[PDB]
Amino acid sequence: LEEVIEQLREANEPVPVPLELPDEDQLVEIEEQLFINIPFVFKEFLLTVSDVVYGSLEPVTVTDPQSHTYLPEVCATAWDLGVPRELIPICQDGEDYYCVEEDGTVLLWSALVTEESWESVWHWARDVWLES
Ligand SMILES: [Ca+2]
Numbered sequence: 215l216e217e218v219i220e221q222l223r224e225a226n227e228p229v230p231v232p233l234e235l236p237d238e239d240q241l242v243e244i245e246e247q248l249f250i251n252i253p254f255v256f257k258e259f260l261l262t263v264s265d266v267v268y269g270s271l272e273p274v275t276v277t278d279p280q281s282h283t284y285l286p287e288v289c290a291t292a293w294d295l296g297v298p299r300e301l302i303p304i305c306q307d308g309e310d311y312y313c314v315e316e317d318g319t320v321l322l323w324s325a326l327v328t329e330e331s332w333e334s335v336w337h338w339a340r341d342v343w344l345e346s
């Protein structure tokens with residue numbers, strides 16, 4: 215875990231306006247707004263690397279309501295597009311969405327869910343995000 219986090223943090227790409235990392239209170243606000251419980255490991259991801267910019271994928275964030283990756287807006291768009299309400303998007307990819315199950319499994323929903331999945335958000339970060 216420490217390994218993957220370090221890899222992402224050190225690979226962070228500079229941008230004009232740096233992204234902000236949320237605190238626990240901010241995550242609670244998002245959960246309440248969506249009336250859902252964010253899986254623990256997913257919450258850990260948001261609290262440790264959601265300020266990171268890297269590769270060709272831009273995962274969800276919770277600190278800038280005007281961002282195209284703002285979780286509440288991404289959820290609304292994904293759920294309206296067909297993503298099961300029980301799945302919380304972690305990263306948009308075109309019209310597809312990498313989403314997280316209540317138990318933490320990451321799935322890929324094709325504009326139904328495909329056959330590929332990742333054991334955790336960290337597996338996804340290491341094997342998909344860091345490989346982009
Ligand atoms: Ca299960």
Ligand SMILES: [Ca+2]
Pocket residue numbers: 315317318319
């Ligand atoms: Ca599962």
